[PDB]
């Protein structure tokens, strides 16, 4: 009995009877705070405690799973630091925005330049959202991380037309893009089930900030940073902010992000897209 099977790479053991020499042809069987990263730092005194996505910290690629023979670069200070993005003005009918990582930082800083000169990319991310309000403001924001977020299309509304979203929507860049039908998230999936993935609630009466640490999640250790988007970020105003007349109507939403444990490989020429 050679070990060719699919379940023989895990830590769980199963009992199975097999009448052939291949284990995959067998049967089933019995089943058994202040964050300082690099040159930048942040202090969040109003923020809820940090939510670690799937209970794992970002770390360097081990030699067991690493298939690349090149020795990667680790520019710790010039790569991993807090990157502040543009602010999104909130309105009562605002449907929410979404960003595609790691497509936002491709044009920004040393991280963006080395990403164009390197074919292989692996890093962890740090998600931070900032929305400020006073005691007279009542609202709620839902900040969630959905791995492999695919954009759909209404197909003209009839359903008989085959159309795909262009590169502007699938690759919004640094500025981001806005949701059309937040109920389906343009995935055809309910919004009420979005909390199954790592999420954090921003309630303007208590916590005005959010922090989520998302590690690297892919079926491959290294992957191209330009084409493949790892996960998206969703800031959805579930409860519309309400304020009476005379109060300040401009409520910004600031999203700052940082990479963690970045490794680059395959030094090559300049490749934009």
């Amino acid at each position, epitope marked *: 009995e050679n070990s060719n099977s699919a379940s023989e790479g895990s830590t769980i053991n199963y009992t199975t009877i097999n009448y052939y020499k291949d284990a995959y042809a067998a049967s089933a069987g019995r089943q058994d705070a202040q964050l300082t990263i690099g040159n930048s730092t942040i202090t969040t005194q109003e923020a809820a405690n940090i939510v670690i996505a799937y209970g794992e910290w970002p770390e360097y690629c081990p030699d067991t799973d690493a298939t690349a023979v090149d020795k990667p670069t680790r520019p710790d200070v010039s790569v991993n630091r807090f990157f502040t993005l543009d602010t*999104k003005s909130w*309105a*009562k*009918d*605002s*449907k929410g*925005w979404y960003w595609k990582f790691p497509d936002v930082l491709t044009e920004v800083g040393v991280f963006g330049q080395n990403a164009q000169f390197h074919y292989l990319y692996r890093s962890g991310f740090c998600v931070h959202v900032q929305c400020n309000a006073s005691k007279f403001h009542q609202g709620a924001l839902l900040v969630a991380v959905l791995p492999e977020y695919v954009l759909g299309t209404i197909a003209g509304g009839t359903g008989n037309e085959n159309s795909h979203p262009p590169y*502007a929507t699938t690759q*919004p860049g640094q*500025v*981001g*893009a*806005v949701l059309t039908h937040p109920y389906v998230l343009d995935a055809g999936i309910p919004l009420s089930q979005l909390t199954v993935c790592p999420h954090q609630w921003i309630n303007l009466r208590t916590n005005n900030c959010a922090t989520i640490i998302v590690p690297y999640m892919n079926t491959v250790p290294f992957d191209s940073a330009l084409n493949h988007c790892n996960f998206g970020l969703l800031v959805i105003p579930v409860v519309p902010l309400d304020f009476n*007349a*005379g*109060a300040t*109507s401009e409520i910004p939403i600031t999203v700052t992000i940082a990479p963690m444990c970045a490794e680059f490989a395959g030094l090559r020429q300049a490749v934009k897209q």
Partner: antibody
Amino acid sequence: QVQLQQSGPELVKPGASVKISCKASGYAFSTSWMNWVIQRPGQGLEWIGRIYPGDGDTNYNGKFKGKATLTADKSSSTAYMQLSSLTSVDSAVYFCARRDYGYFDYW
Amino acid sequence: DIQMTQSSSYLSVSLGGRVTITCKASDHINNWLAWYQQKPGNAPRLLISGATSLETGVPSRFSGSGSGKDYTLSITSLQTEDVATYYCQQYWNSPYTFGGGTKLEIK
């Protein structure tokens, strides 16, 4: 200089839809908001809605929430306003302006 | 929904004199107001921004002033090209409420 070029007049029977073009020139199209203003002859004036061409979000009013739909194109630097369910009271003069410090700098 | 009343609709002053137009709102706008000038058949033109500061290209005869909920617009002196319909805007809160308007004529 900054120039805003609209389209010409339109004549259509009630019940159809109409699209109006506004094209900015000499300024960054996705950097600033693009508003819309209706003037009802001759004494009425009110604000319609705005759009940010970078993201594409739309901020409407209470009455015009369901009637008007705003879209934008970053390639041609042009903003669109689509009206649905046109009636006799929906005939008026439409304006295209931009927001800078919170006022309307150019019409 | 902030109602801002502009009264009255019609007032007449001769040339070489002074004119005062009051634009009052319901709540405190934090001195954010924009006076407009629209000639018949043309688009509005900005004059005062923030109830005090001027624009570039606007003559110094236009001077806005005010405090609290009462804001005025003083034009001295009056000429033949300054006769038009004047407006006032509140950009402090959304939606932006435009003024009722004041049409000027010679007495």
